[PDB]
């Protein structure tokens, strides 16, 4: 409401599938993303995979 700000999502989706262009990973969590209405969401789906998580 006011911590948060959208920008652009076509800015983190396009990068969700770039990136997975670039790293090449489980592009079922880039579909993830495609639905994501937060900027931070978005960004944070494609980064997700690029760490793997950690025992979830």
């Keep these: 409401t006011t911590y948060?700000?959208?920008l652009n999502l076509?800015?983190?989706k396009?990068?969700?599938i770039k990136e997975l262009v670039?790293?090449?990973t489980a592009e079922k969590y880039i579909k993830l993303?495609?639905?994501a209405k937060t900027v931070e969401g978005v960004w944070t789906l494609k980064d997700e995979?690029?760490?793997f998580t950690v025992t979830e």
Aim: aromatic share 0%; hydrophobic share 45%.
């Design 33 to 35: 993303i495609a639905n």
């Design 22 to 24: 670039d790293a090449g």
């Design 4 to 6: 948060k700000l959208i």
């Design 14 to 16: 396009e990068e969700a």
């Design 10 to 12: 076509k800015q983190a």
């Design 49 to 51: 995979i690029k760490t």
